[PDB]
């Protein structure tokens, strides 16, 4: 079993990449792909509160962490117990970069919150779709651009402090190459375990 | 302004105490009575999830999220107006109930709630210290009795500066008087 998360800003091609990589991995592994809330009823009700939110950033961060726990308990943990490879589109690192860094709560504060939610369940491997701010901008106002750059800056601060868990993939390449590198990184990891 | 929370297990006379203290303090102060979620839309929606539908950590994070919304949208605006806010249950209830009695761990729940309150600790906290036996009589099953006892043990650990322990085994008239005198001494100094 392996718990692999996918991370990146908007414009990294993350969702297109995970979809392709998953389609290729299904041919050789017992794998599922999910994201939060991912159909878990409580997480879906929490999602509705977030979308209906000038919500206080700490309340928003707690709602993401509550959804994360419900999705972890109902979907992720049972699949890992059945020996599956679990691919998850966004996890703890999205809260660290968005709520912690870009919104300014602080990465360390948001990490403490998320550690309460995940109760030790860190990913075995996190693929970071490393898109430059400029390529990201072109794939997508001043406020939206400032936020996008701050999300990228946050991910770089997180990856600098936890190098071993992450595998950075060049997301500035054509999408076919991003898919290939991510798939190869994953199979290299899965064949070692 | 003053932020005063009230804590205690069921059967501590907490409802009677807050209402009677409110009625006496309104003569001299701009006072409000509140409890979470306290009518804050988001908090009320979180409460519906809790009541109409759970993993204990998800539950703890929902109480904390409702706590933050009630603090930001109701408590802080009242404190800014110069109000005395009488709040029925706060951080200490999550520590005693989720942390201790439900078994998540007091330290884990404390960290969660410090994220939620971001330094906004009560100015004063009245703990209505009732014995399990007097509390049980005021309430009126084995699992419920043991849970009530665990809640009390949870509060004992928390209490072990803002805390003012009032002897809630006394008749309620005396519990009210002691609580009111404790609050006046705080407000007037
Ligand atoms: C997992 C995670 C993600 N993200 C970002 C990633 C980029 C998109 N954004 C938006 C947020 C916005 C406030 C509605 C604008 C956004 C966009 C679409 C949706 C949807 O599912 O339709 C959405 O809802 C969700 C998603 C996941 C959990 C819950 Br609960 C609610 C939020 C959320 C964080 O910031 N932190 C995190 O931990
Ligand atoms: C502030 C706080 C309280 N409590 C306890 C105190 C004793 C009562 N219990 C129950 C819980 C139960 C699971 C439904 C049995 C209970 C009973 C009635 C209600 C209702 O308001 O109708 C209720 O809903 C709420 C209350 C507050 C916030 C949100 Br959100 C939902 C929960 C909650 C904790 O445990 N931690 C805390 O931080």
Write the layout of secondary structure elements.
Two copies of one chain form a homodimer.
Chain A: E1 2-7, H1 14-25, E2 31-35, H2 41-51, H3 57-81, E3 85-89, H4 92-102, H5 107-118, E4 125-130, H6 133-139, H7 142-161, E5 166-170, H8 175-192
Helix pairs in contact in A: 1-8, 2-3, 3-4, 3-5, 4-5, 4-7
The complex binds the ligand Cc1cn([C@H]2CCCN([C@H](CC(C)(C)C)c3ccc(C(=O)O)c(Oc4cccc(Br)c4)c3)C2)c(=O)[nH]c1=O (2 copies).
Structural class of chain A: alpha/beta
Main interface pair? A-B, 25 and 23 residues
Overall geometric form of chain A: globular
Number of domains of chain A: 1
Element order of chain A: H for helix, E for strand:
EHEHHEHHEHHEH
Number of helices of chain A: 8
Oligomer: homodimer
Instruction: For the largest sheet of chain A, list the strands in their spatial order.
Output: 2-3-1-4-5
Helix content of chain A: 55-70%
Distance between the termini of chain A: 9 Å
Question: Which percent range describes the beta-strand content of chain A?
Answer: 5-15%
CATH architecture of chain A: 3-Layer(aba) Sandwich
Please state the CA-atom Rg of chain A, rounded to the nearest Å: 16 Å
Strands of chain A, total number: 5
CATH superfamily of chain A: P-loop containing nucleotide triphosphate hydrolases
Q: Name every ligand kind in the structure.
A: ligand 0YB
CATH topology of chain A: Rossmann fold
């Amino acid at each position: 079993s392996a718990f692999i998360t996918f991370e990146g800003p908007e414009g990294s091609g993350k969702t297109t990449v995970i979809n392709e990589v998953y389609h290729r991995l299904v041919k050789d592994y017992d794998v599922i792909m999910t994201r939060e809330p991912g159909g878990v009823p409580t997480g879906e009700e929490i999602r509705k509160i977030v979308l209906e939110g000038d919500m206080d950033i700490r309340t928003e961060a707690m709602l993401f962490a509550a959804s994360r726990r419900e999705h972890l308990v109902l979907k992720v943990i049972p699949a890992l117990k059945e020996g599956k490879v679990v691919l998850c589109d966004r996890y703890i690192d999205s809260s660290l970069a968005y709520q912690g860094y870009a919104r300014g709560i602080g990465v360390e504060e948001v990490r403490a919150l998320n550690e309460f939610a995940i109760n030790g369940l860190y990913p075995d491997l996190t693929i970071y779709l490393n898109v430059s701010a400029e390529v990201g901008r072109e794939r997508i106002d001043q406020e939206d651009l400032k936020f996008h750059e701050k999300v990228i800056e946050g991910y770089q601060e997180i990856i600098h402090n936890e190098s071993q868990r992450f595998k950075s993939v060049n997301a500035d390449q054509p999408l076919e190459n991003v898919v290939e590198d991510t798939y190869q990184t994953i199979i290299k990891y899965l064949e070692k375990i």
